[PDB]
Amino acid sequence: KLPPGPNLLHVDFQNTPYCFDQLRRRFGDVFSLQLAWTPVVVLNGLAAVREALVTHGEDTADRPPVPITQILGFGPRSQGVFLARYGPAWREQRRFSVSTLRNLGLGKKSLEQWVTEEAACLCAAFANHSGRPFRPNGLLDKAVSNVIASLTCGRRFEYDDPRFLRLLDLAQEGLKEESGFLREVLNAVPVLLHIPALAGKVLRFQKAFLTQLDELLTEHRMTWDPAQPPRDLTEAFLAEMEKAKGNPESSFNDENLRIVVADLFSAGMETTSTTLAWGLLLMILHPDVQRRVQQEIDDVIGQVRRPEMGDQAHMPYTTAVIHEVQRFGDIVPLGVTHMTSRDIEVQGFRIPKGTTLITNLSSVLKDEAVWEKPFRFHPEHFLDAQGHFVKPEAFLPFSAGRRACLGEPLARMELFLFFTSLLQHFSFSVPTGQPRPSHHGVFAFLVSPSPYELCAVPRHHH
Numbered sequence: 422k423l424p425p426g427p428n429l430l431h432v433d434f435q436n437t438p439y440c441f442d443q444l445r446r447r448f449g450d451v452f453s454l455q456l457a458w459t460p461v462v463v464l465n466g467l468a469a470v471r472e473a474l475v476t477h478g479e480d481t482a483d484r485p486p487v488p489i490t491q492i493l494g495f496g497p498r499s500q501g502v503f504l505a506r507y508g509p510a511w512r513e514q515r516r517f518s519v520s521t522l523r524n525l526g527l528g529k530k531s532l533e534q535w536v537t538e539e540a541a542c543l544c545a546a547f548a549n550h551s552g553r554p555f556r557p558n559g560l561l562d563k564a565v566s567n568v569i570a571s572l573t574c575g576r577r578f579e580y581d582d583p584r585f586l587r588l589l590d591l592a593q594e595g596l597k598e599e600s601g602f603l604r605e606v607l608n609a610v611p612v613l614l615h616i617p618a619l620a621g622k623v624l625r626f627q628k629a630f631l632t633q634l635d636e637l638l639t640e641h642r643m644t645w646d647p648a649q650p651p652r653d654l655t656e657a658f659l660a661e662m663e664k665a666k667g668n669p670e671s672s673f674n675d676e677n678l679r680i681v682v683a684d685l686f687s688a689g690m691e692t693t694s695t696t697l698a699w700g701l702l703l704m705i706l707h708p709d710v711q712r713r714v715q716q717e718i719d720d721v722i723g724q725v726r727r728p729e730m731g732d733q734a735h736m737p738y739t740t741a742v743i744h745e746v747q748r749f750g751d752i753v754p755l756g757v758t759h760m761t762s763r764d765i766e767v768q769g770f771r772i773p774k775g776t777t778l779i780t781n782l783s784s785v786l787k788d789e790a791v792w793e794k795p796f797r798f799h800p801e802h803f804l805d806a807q808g809h810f811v812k813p814e815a816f817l818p819f820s821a822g823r824r825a826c827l828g829e830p831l832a833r834m835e836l837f838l839f840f841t842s843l844l845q846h847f848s849f850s851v852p853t854g855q856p857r858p859s860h861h862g863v864f865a866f867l868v869s870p871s872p873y874e875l876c877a878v879p880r881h882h883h
């Protein structure tokens with residue numbers, strides 16, 4: 422009983438999410454596609470995604486093999502987390518990252534204070550624009566990159582630092598290669614790998630990004646004090662590397678240190694800062710909502726004191742707006758692919774072993790059966806009539822199951838602290854004479870808002 426479907430060129434790749442709406446209205450919530458000899462089943466809506474990732478989660482936590490990553494040093498015990506196959510290498514790094522982030526202060530007050538210190542740096546770089554129009558994306562990336570740089574590498578960088586700039590530039594470009602035509606065709610057709618020029622051109626920026634990290638990791642190895650408890654995730658990793666010398670089963674090796682640190686670092690940049698970029702864009706398209714958040718900040722926090730996570734429970738409207746920015750911004754619309762380890766049943770359809778699953782997360786965040794006004798920016802999607810915060814089950818921007826985004830608690834903290842700090846100290850607006858920016862993003866693996874400019878005008882002198 423396989424799922425219905427049409428394939429290879431009946432799929433618009435310059436606007437895939439809208440194409441998958443058409444096939445879902447045609448064939449239903451679970452449909453098939455055959456793309457380059459790989460069988461694909463697309464999952465749509467909460468129940469199909471939840472059935473596959475939670476109910477059959479034991480059989481859907483694997484990823485599709487990616488032989489092109491062999492250039493970045495990937496091997497059976499060197500697989501990072503994000504593209505790692507389901508197995509001991511993935512499980513050890515995932516638990517290590519999850520608990521190392523926690524022990525470095527994630528769920529606690531030292532990280533909150535760190536993030537608001539970085540928000541102040543970001544606020545100051547905003548004020549240095551003298552109320553003139555500017556694209557906020559670059560400074561967002563730097564402020565958010567410094568948070569993950571702090572957790573993984575034990576340091577931040579100056580916004581003018583050329584090494585930081587190169588690091589961000591290579592990462593943004595290396596992300597663009599993950600969803601480029603060349604990358605998948607050699608991952609699809611493997612043999613083309615050996616051809617020298619094809620090997621030297623693909624993942625040039627991802628290989629450059631890793632090279633630039635090796636340089637920071639080498640300096641960190643110089644400054645690390647093993648006689649003291651690990652200050653950051655790289656030190657925690659290196660300590661585990663030492664204990665594991667002589668153990669060829671450990672994923673704590675030199676090949677995996679650069680991959681894991683790159684994984685967390687690059688993920689820590691591109692996600693939260695893109696969401697924040699949608700946030701500001703939507704605050705200048707909906708100044709009524711901006712003003713209402715600014716009112717809630719004043720009644721709970723004030724205009725001088727820095728925000729804390731203990732405020733959020735008393736700020737349902739600001740929490741609603743932030744959730745709505747993630748729901749509307751829809752930053753990863755087609756998720757990250759999984760693959761079945763067994764035959765499974767989703768929505769009464771049989772899905773064979775070895776099928777690439779596409780969790781259509783956009784079809785969950787914008788499900789017309791679930792949300793009042795899915796195609797509008799509407800904070801009341803997360804509010805009830807008395808103004809209490811409610812989170813529907815369809816809020817799945819981080820996916821579900823054993824592979825669900827391990828960054829989620831850091832993202833939640835960063836989103837709240839950076840967002841409220843910016844709105845606490847500035848008033849954001851479309852620039853005086855410019856056309857009203859689009860609310861449609863540019864589709865890639867990650868969906869950023871269409872490029873726009875804003876003006877940040879302080880709310881106070883003192």
Ligand code: HEM
Pocket residue numbers: 502503504505515569684685688689690692693696752753756757758780782818819820821823824825826827828829831832
């Ligand atoms: C707004 C911010 C973010 C969003 C919307 C987001 C979304 C996602 C999604 C949809 C997945 C795929 C889960 C699946 O396989 O079904 C994922 C995985 C992952 N994310 Fe995030 N992410 C965000 C921020 C972050 C941050 C800040 C980090 C690191 C600190 C991070 C690290 C990871 C990692 C390592 C994985 C792989 C998890 C695994 O395979 O076990 N993400 N994320």
Ligand SMILES: CC1(C)SCCN(S(=O)(=O)c2ccc(Oc3ccncc3)cc2)[C@H]1C(=O)NO
Pocket residue numbers: 493501503504592595596597599627680681683684685687688691692753826828867
């Ligand atoms: C270590 C690697 C260079 S190995 C090859 C792939 N990249 S990448 O820089 O192209 C990348 C970055 C972010 C991302 O999107 C995310 C991540 C996390 N949560 C939600 C969305 C996807 C891919 C690195 C990687 O795996 N990072 O995680």
Ligand SMILES: [Zn+2]
Pocket residue numbers: 574575641645652653655656
């Ligand atoms: Zn350190």
Ligand SMILES: [Zn+2]
Pocket residue numbers: 805807808809
């Ligand atoms: Zn209520």
Ligand SMILES: [Zn+2]
Pocket residue numbers: 724845846879880881
């Ligand atoms: Zn101020």
